[PDB]
Amino acid sequence: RMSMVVSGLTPEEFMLVYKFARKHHITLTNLITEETTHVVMKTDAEFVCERTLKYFLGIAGGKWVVSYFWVTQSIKERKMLNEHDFEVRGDVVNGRNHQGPKRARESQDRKIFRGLEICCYGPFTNMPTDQLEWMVQLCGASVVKELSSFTLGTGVHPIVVVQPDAWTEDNGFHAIGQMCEAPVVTREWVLDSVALYQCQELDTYLIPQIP
Template sequence: MSFTPEDLFNNAQIFVSKLNQREISEEDKENIISLKTVSSQKTTCTLDIMTDDSITDNNYLVASPCVSIKRETKPLVLITSGLAATESEVIHKFLGFFNATLLPKYSDDVTHVIVKTDENLKCERTLKYFLGVAGKKWVMSMEWARSCLSAMKIIDEEYFEVRGDTLTETDTLAPKISRLSGSHLRLNSTLSVERENLLSRFQICCFGNFTVDLPCDDLKRLIALCGARLVNSPSFFKLNGLKNTQNMVKCDGKKIAVIVAQTEANPQLDVNRYNDFYRRYNAFPVAREWIFDCVALYDVVPLVHYLHCQRDILKYPDLNYATKMKEE
């Protein structure tokens, strides 16, 4: 017979009530004093019936003065974004109560990204938000931390998962779609298996300077989390030896070449230079906002609205692909 953590919690309260009313014999008390591990789909709990009031260990969720439930789950590792000072105080209480860790920057160890949201569970676009989505982490409203503290247990994350960003009118559900998508396998042109992610079919070069709001290294990390192949120079695109995007996608299965550049940080780059990039490297020069929107929607959006080069110089197969961004 299996029990959920909630069943365990409720049964413990009933037992304590009977214990306090002396309706349980000493022999029964000894038999039930320490209940062993009980498993559920999301967590494993150990229930210990305590007879003194000195429960101070933050690893325990106190059900009553005599009951504690210890959770044996993966350690919680958090990063936060956009929180006010009062909200940061709540997070520090959360850290102590649930023995969680707070990191200053994103890392692969992160389990939850905590952000400030509006009433529609939408948040501002920040680097940490994008990294959380691309990294398939739980991206949570600040209200989740408050609710966990109020309930003295970890609440189901799905009720508080961020539903999108404030720049997008509709609910994109990008964090959930990314988290559940995983990285599926596909056969490449050599019939070997490789993992496919959001931008796995692209090779991307971050070219020139970038402003301090999103340094080049951070942008590259975001792109890498999305599964694209990073190259250090547009000249490496020539290694494919392919003549057009149609061949790259449909024949050889090679990766689409994209050059990401920030115009305002590179005044020396004009439309003629971007046109030359396309002609020389058969690479689409685009604004970095293309990356942001792909992650925000968790979909490969058309390149045509982000092009730095002139649209009329694109060859037909390239123009068709840049407009639709869908494979047949």
């Protein structure tokens, strides 16, 4: 049926979503999972939201990513309006009009990370690693745990993803190209890619490797 999580709300606001859920027999939970059908975001007047994990796992799963205005309006009009009509256009980083969630809902047959082996390497922040990994699998990539366990051959295309911020070492991520043969890039490659639901030419994200 319908199962919701919310992102960016206040308790007051959450309470309104709850009232909504009660009226319409919609399930409402704290954590996002496979079953989650909807992701309710705090947006501005033009449905521009912030980027949060739920936001990403939302698009990645092709869930409904809908502005909080879906709720209040539905309450205000004593009935449940169309998700179609309140969907989030974009975000405060990737643009007000990119229609990410849209694409997704209609691309579950060709996922942006078809034929990719991704290895999320090293420490991350604000986002547990297994979640970033879950993210990329939802997009069709294949997760790999250790640099040395990329699937050699040609069949596939490997990629190492790092978040430089969270490192406590001097010269050590400039030198991944020593222990494997994959392009290296920042998390922003994935997040950006998932936001837009477009595969971002590695170009802008590559990290330079000590020969």
